[model samples]
Target: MKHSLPDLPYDYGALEPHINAQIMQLHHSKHHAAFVNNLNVTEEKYQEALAKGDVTAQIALQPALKFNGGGHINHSIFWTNLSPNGGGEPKGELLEAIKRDFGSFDKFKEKLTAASVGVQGSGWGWLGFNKERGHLQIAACPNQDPLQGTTGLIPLLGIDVWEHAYYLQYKNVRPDYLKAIWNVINWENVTERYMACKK
Candidate 1:
């Protein structure tokens, strides 16, 4: 099926105080929409190639399909994993897993935050459930690469390290931006995603 932009779980301004409405609007409407549209177009082309039995055409379009399709999928999940009311601590099994894997909740947050702030270029920091390994893990993916494909991890929550995600509010200092974003993180959403992913 062709991809479409998922509806925002809360208003753009809902993330306000931490994330401004302007950035959220532009991020969801413009940046994410571009990926969704490109993915749809690429999928259509793939269908055509399949009909024509053109393996060469299919192979040639791999980059476009993978990048755009992965971007659309990953960002869709990413957006839902955040909320204005979020941030604090994980709950239930998700919380237990974090402490199990990373020592304590505080240390887990510290590690994740440090890794997020350390991203040099555009990318994302992910808290993922590694089902194959039966544990939780933290990771970073450059650009819009999907964490699942790139690292075989089921993303629990993610932070966008792209400048556009925080530059207006935090300017050149990315750590400040990363630190502030916690106020609006949707822990409830993240917990729900974690449970669903496990299913």
Candidate 2:
């Protein structure tokens, strides 16, 4: 089956104060929906190429598949990574693991924040689980690149550093947008993702 866009867990205005309704509505309905639609288009063509056994056609489709597919994948997790009642710190085993891996919860935030603030271009800043090392790790991905596919890190939480993510609301200041987003972080969802890595 072709991919589809998922509805937001909360209304556009739900993430207000931290992220405005205008930005949320546009980001979800316009930007992300475009990616989902384009991915479906790319997938259909890819299957056609594979069926005909055309190597050149398959090669030509690779970039579109990776770009739009990753856009859809990244945004799916991004929406879940936020909540209206989110923010503060995590709890239980997740909290302990974060502390153990990063020394302290505050420091973990620091590294993730810096990584996000420092993206050279449109990209994502991730707090992922290192299955190889069996610990938490911070990473960055450029231009809608999927985290696990490229880095082997299981995405637990992510911050979209793309200008479109915060430009309308935060303007040219990425750090401010990043700061406010912490207030809306769905730590409970992140904890669940982290748990899945263990199993």
Candidate 3:
């Protein structure tokens, strides 16, 4: 089956004052949609190679598969990680795990923020569940690398640090974009993902 772009949960204007409608519109409609299309195209080629038992062709397609595949996977999660009614620290079992794993909510925020801002170029910052360690963890990925595939971390929340994600609105200040993102984060969605990972 072909990969497809997932719909944003809220309207483009929903995250206004923080992310703004224009950014959300282009990010989802243009950027993410491109990823989905490219992923579908890449997968079709891979299937053809598999049919012919062409290892060399399969090898060549690896980068395309990973890039487009990760773009689709990461963006899908990133969209759910925000909400018009989001923000304000998490609650319940998820909050308890966060505090236990990362000192406190404020520290957790700072840590994730630092990881995100530290990305040298286009990439992602993630809050993921380390099932092997049975705890929450913070990690960064370069480009569209997916957390689960590259790091064995089940992504609970993800922030895209790609220039396109913030450059238009935040300009050269990536830190500002990270800070404002908290105002619209769907902690509720993140908490659910964490719980689901455990189950």
Cα-based lDDT for every prediction: 0.85, 0.92, 0.91
Q: In candidate 2, what are the lDDT values of residues 50-83, reduced to their tens digit?
A: 9999989999998888899999999999999999
Off by over 4 Å in 2: none
Query: Which candidate do you rate higher for TM-score, 1 or 3?
Result: 3
Cα deviation at 104, candidate 1, in Å, is 1.1
Worst 10 residues of 1 by lDDT: 81-90
Leading candidate by lDDT: 2
Measured against the true structure, the TM-scores of the candidates, in listed sequence, are: 0.93, 0.98, 0.98
RMSD of 3: 0.8
The positional error of residue 189 in candidate 2, measured at the CA in angstroms, is 0.5
Model 3 C-alpha lDDT versus the unseen true structure: 0.91
Return the TM-score for candidate 2, rounded to 2 decimals: 0.98
Better of 1 and 2 by lDDT: 2
Clashing pairs in model 3, backbone N/Cα/C closer than 3 A: none
With a 3 Å backbone cut-off (N, CA, C), the pairs that clash in candidate 2 are: none
